[PDB]
Amino acid sequence: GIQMENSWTISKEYHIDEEVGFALPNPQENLPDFYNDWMFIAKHLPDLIESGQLRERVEKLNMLSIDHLTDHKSQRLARLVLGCITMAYVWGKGHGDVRKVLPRNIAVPYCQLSKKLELPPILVYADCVLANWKKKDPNKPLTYENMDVLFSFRDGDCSKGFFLVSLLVEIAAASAIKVIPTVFKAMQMQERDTLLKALLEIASCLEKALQVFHQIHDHVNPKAFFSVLRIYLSGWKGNPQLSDGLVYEGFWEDPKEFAGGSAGQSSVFQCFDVLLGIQQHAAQFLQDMRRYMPPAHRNFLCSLESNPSVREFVLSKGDAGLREAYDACVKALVSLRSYHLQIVTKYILIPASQTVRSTTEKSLL
Numbered sequence: 470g471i472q473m474e475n476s477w478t479i480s481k482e483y484h485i486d487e488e489v490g491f492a493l494p495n496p497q498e499n500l501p502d503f504y505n506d507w508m509f510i511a512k513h514l515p516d517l518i519e520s521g522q523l524r525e526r527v528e529k530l531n532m533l534s535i536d537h538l539t540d541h542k543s544q545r546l547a548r549l550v551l552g553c554i555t556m557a558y559v560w561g562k563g564h565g566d567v568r569k570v571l572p573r574n575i576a577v578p579y580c581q582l583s584k585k586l587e588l589p590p591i592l593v594y595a596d597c598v599l600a601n602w603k604k605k606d607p608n609k610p611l612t613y614e615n616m617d618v619l620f621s622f623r624d625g626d627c628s629k630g631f632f633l634v635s636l637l638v639e640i641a642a643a644s645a646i647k648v649i650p651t652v653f654k655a656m657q658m659q660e661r662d663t664l665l666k667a668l669l670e671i672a673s674c675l676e677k678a679l680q681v682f683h684q685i686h687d688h689v690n691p692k693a694f695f696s697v698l699r700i701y702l703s704g705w706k707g708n709p710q711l712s713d714g715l716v717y718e719g720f721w722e723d724p725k726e727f728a729g730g731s732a733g734q735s736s737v738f739q740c741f742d743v744l745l746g747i748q749q750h751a752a753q754f755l756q757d758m759r760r761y762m763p764p765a766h767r768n769f770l771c772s773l774e775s776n777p778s779v780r781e782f783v784l785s786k787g788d789a790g791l792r793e794a795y796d797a798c799v800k801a802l803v804s805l806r807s808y809h810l811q812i813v814t815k816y817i818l819i820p821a822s823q824t825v826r827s828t829t830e831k832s833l834l
């Protein structure tokens with residue numbers, strides 16, 4: 470089911486980089502001069518929100534056409550800019566003074582760009598993480614030390630720690646995604662060792678991805694996350710503060726509901742759920758968040774579901790090494806989901822005070 474570019478590498482239409490996976494490779498940092506007013510607001514979001522200046526600065530913008538964003542990277546950068554501006558405009562300082570209408574000079578170009586990219590007109594994982602990063606030194610490896618985000622909402626919102634640790638988890642998982650064609654090849658060729666080493670490589674990369682996930686505690690403070698950053702990742706779908714949604718002035722007449730951030734927007738959980746056949750109203754929210762992933766990445770997840778099952782192949786072999794390599798992959802994925810629930814508990818549930826994991830742990834044998 471996976472379309473191949475050649476005998477080794479999956480098709481470029483999936484937009485999956487060998488080094489950074491679902492992340493956008495070498496994101497664009499600067500827009501054309503034509504868009505300098507957008508870039509100024511987005512780069513000054515912290516001080517503009519703090520000073521109460523953001524909303525009126527947005528209301529003074531002129532209408533800028535999207536016709537000059539001529540390539541994928543420039544359009545993804547513009548989506549990140551307009552997306553951050555939009556979140557900052559709707560929520561403001563996050564105290565309760567919300568805006569239920571997005572001015573047209575942002576809404577129209579934002580919604581037109583989102584239409585081109587087939588993404589909802591709201592900030593999504595693919596914006597604020599997958600495309601929101603740069604290398605400090607191009608000649609040095611992808612490390613926290615050597616990386617930075619492009620945009621933040623409030624000084625001290627820990628957006629670098631939160632977004633970059635997430636990104637580095639995605640990059641660790643990239644080293645596992647590149648092995649997927651080897652898994653299916655080894656199954657058609659009945660190559661025991663090739664499949665075994667592929668599965669152990671995937672397990673090793675997902676375990677490294679968990680070790681990267683651990684870094685979150687060193688760069689994100691629970692209070693700052695729950696009280697500040699979480700605000701700007703919140704949406705207008707089932708939100709009592711925007712019960713009917715947001716009016717995109719000049720694009721739709723009626724308000725429209727779009728969901729805020731969710732860990733389900735990372736294609737990593739589903740990619741290896743499907744590969745390992747450890748797939749689970751929650752299925753309705755899972756599929757919905759799939760439509761918040763980049764379209765090419767949805768198509769990769771779907772092509773994966775059309776390949777033969779690795780679980781079945783492995784358990785029919787009477788092959789302890791293959792079963793233990795498969796189990797190491799599932800265990801790695803279950804541990805990532807456990808840690809996501811631990812982070813939800815420490816960074817949302819506890820500060821608020823003051824089942825996917827089960828389906829996956831069931832499919833171990």
Ligand SMILES: Cc1ccc(NC(=O)OC[C@]23CN(S(=O)(=O)c4ccc(C(C)(C)C)cc4)C[C@H]2C[C@H]2C[C@@H]3C2(C)C)cc1
Nearest residue numbers: 592593594635638639702730731732733734735737809812
């Ligand atoms: C817009 C937006 C903003 C951020 C995100 N983040 C996201 O999808 O992260 C994926 C994670 C889960 N988190 S998390 O810290 O548990 C985590 C916890 C909560 C959230 C929100 C605030 C959205 C509810 C987000 C993330 C870290 C990251 C690392 C590992 C585990 C998966 C991973 C890649 C496999 C999505 C939408």
